[PDB]
Amino acid sequence: TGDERFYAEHLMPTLQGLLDPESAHRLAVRFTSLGLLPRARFQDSDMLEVRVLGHKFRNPVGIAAGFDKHGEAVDGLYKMGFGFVEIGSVTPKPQEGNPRPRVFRLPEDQAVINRYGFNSHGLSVVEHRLRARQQKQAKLTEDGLPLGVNLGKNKTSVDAAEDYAEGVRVLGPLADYLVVNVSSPNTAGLRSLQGKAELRRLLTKVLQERDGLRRVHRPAVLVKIAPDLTSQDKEDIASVVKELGIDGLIVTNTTVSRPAGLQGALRSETGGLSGKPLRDLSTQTIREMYALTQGRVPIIGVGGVSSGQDALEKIRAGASLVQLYTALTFWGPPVVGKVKRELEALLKEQGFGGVTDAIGADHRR
Ligand SMILES: COC(=O)/C(C#N)=C1\SCC(=O)N1c1ccc(C(=O)Nc2ccc(C(C)(C)C)cc2)cc1
Ligand SMILES: Cc1cc2nc3c(=O)[nH]c(=O)nc-3n(C[C@H](O)[C@H](O)[C@H](O)COP(=O)(O)O)c2cc1C
Ligand SMILES: O=C(O)c1cc(=O)[nH]c(=O)[nH]1
Fold first, then answer.
1. Structural domains of the chain in order of their starting residue, each with its CATH number
2. How is the protein modified post-translationally, according to the record?
């Protein structure tokens, strides 16, 4: 479209040039929360609907965690055309996160590096924010627009599992799904929660807390993993997920790797790398987890999606749904409709009746 070109070729390069990436993020959150967004001209077709996690999703393209950390822009994000919204990560207590600067744009790589460190308004603030629009959300959910909440842990916590359990109790009742994010690269020790008898201990506690919520307030629980896992870690996670009946996986978080070939001047900043360089690392991790789980565990695929092709690759690899984030700094909001339009076109071109028919299609080749 005309908006797609104007945003990618003019508005975003201008914004990028005037504002550092953190400031641009904050402005984006404000604009979105006010609905100051281009028209989402795209009308979701029936072919894009997916049923998974105990819900209808009008389209399979969601906003990944980290854009709306504190639940300030949820309605705006639906207005953008996302089929689902995930907020967070939210930590139990408020916390500032790392010192500034902590977000870096790598334009030559279509990538970003961030070390936010779980900056969060905390559970109580977010709880109240979601409660103010709880019924508005229940209507959205019923209409195929669900809400996920991603739960973190505070930097100085002495009991990680207890942080997550607090999150389940406070925000679980307000969410269609919860995410245990045990994959931020930017909280010391966090990704060690991805190992075995200990991941099983953590997840058992989170599920117990979830199962204690009243039925209408009982979310699905997903685990979000990194793209930097060993084969051993992957196998272990798949094992535990099956054993405990975790509802789904989010694959992947950002990478602590630095693929060969990055050009940006800021490539050696500490933090998680997102965007194009993560893309195929993420697709491959979807592929592997789909096979380890025998296609029985729904996957939300995320990392470097900026086109329909990138979305379809993840779906065919085993994702039921996809998310994006970093593409917005390069393309802006029009990327959402672009992705959806392109995905629909490809699905038709490859002889799929809808998204659902494409899920895991590469494993049946
Ligand atoms: C002066 O600013 C504007 O005009 C904005 C904004 N601001 C406008 S006019 C209509 C509109 O749609 N906008 C907008 C632009 C970009 C984003 C965005 O999502 N930006 C964005 C910024 C940074 C990142 C990271 C670097 C954190 C990944 C991601 C997205 C969202 C909204
Ligand atoms: C600036 C920034 C902040 C993020 N914060 C979070 C977070 O709080 N929790 C989380 O689970 N993921 C977070 N992510 C990871 C994204 O959810 C996503 O997994 C990753 O960026 C890959 O998708 P993308 O390439 O489309 O950005 C963040 C990513 C970025 C770029
Ligand atoms: O807050 C952050 O630093 C953050 C969290 C997360 O899960 N992933 C990420 O890339 N950054």
1. 1-365 (3.20.20.70)
2. The uncleaved transit peptide is required for mitochondrial targeting and proper membrane integration.
110 pocket-lining for ligand 2 (C-beta < 6 Å) = no
Tell whether residue 66 is among the known ligand binding residues.
yes
The tokens describing 249, both together, are 């996986």
Which ligand 3 atom is at minimum distance from the Cα of 116? Answer: 3
Prior bond of 268 cis (ω within 30°): no
> 183: annotated binding-site residue?
yes
Active site residue 192: no
Ligand nearest to the CA of 275: 2
Residues found in the chain: 365
Task: Give the atom of ligand 2 at the shortest distance from the alpha carbon of 118.
Answer: 8
Alpha helix positions (H), 149-188? 160-171
Q: How was this structure determined?
A: X-ray
**Resolution in angstroms for this experimental structure?**
1.6
Q: Please state, as a whole number, how many other Cβ atoms lie within 10 Å of the Cβ of residue 122.
A: 16
CA angle 115, 116, 118 (to 5 degrees): 125
- What is the SS3 assignment for 79? helix
> Residue 129 region, left (φ>0) first, then alpha (ψ -120 to 50), else beta?
alpha
Helices (H), ranges, 177-300: 196-211, 231-244, 279-292
Q: Which of 9, 30, 328 gets mutated to test ligand 1 (max ligand atoms within 8 A of its CB)?
A: 328
Report the C-alpha gap between 131 and 151 in whole angstroms.
17
Q: Report whether 79 contacts 35 (CB < 8 A).
A: yes
DSSP β-bridge partners for residue 272: 114
Taking the CA of residue 253 as reference, the ligand 2 atom at the shortest distance is 19
Ligand having the closest approach to the CA of 35: 1
Which residue in this structure is represented by tokens 């984030």?
325
